[PDB]
């Protein structure tokens, strides 16, 4: 669950990634 704020906003990953990545 990694997201890369570098300017890549993955709609799919982000959703899932955000929940984890962001608690």
Swiss-Prot record:
It is a peripheral membrane protein; Single-pass type I membrane protein. It comes from the Viruses. It is found in: Virion membrane; Host cell membrane; Host endosome membrane. The mature envelope protein (Env) consists of a homotrimer of non-covalently associated gp120-gp41 heterodimers. The resulting complex protrudes from the virus surface as a spike. There seems to be as few as 10 spikes on the average virion. Interacts with host CD4, CCR5 and CXCR4. Gp120 also interacts with the C-type lectins CD209/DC-SIGN and CLEC4M/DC-SIGNR (collectively referred to as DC-SIGN(R)). Gp120 and gp41 interact with GalCer. Attaches the virus to the host lymphoid cell by binding to the primary receptor CD4. This interaction induces a structural rearrangement creating a high affinity binding site for a chemokine coreceptor like CXCR4 and/or CCR5. Acts as a ligand for CD209/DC-SIGN and CLEC4M/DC-SIGNR, which are respectively found on dendritic cells (DCs), and on endothelial cells of liver sinusoids and lymph node sinuses. These interactions allow capture of viral particles at mucosal surfaces by these cells and subsequent transmission to permissive cells. This is Surface protein gp120. It comes from Human immunodeficiency virus type 1 group M subtype B (isolate SF33). The gene is env. The chain holds residues 484 to 506 of 852 of the full protein.
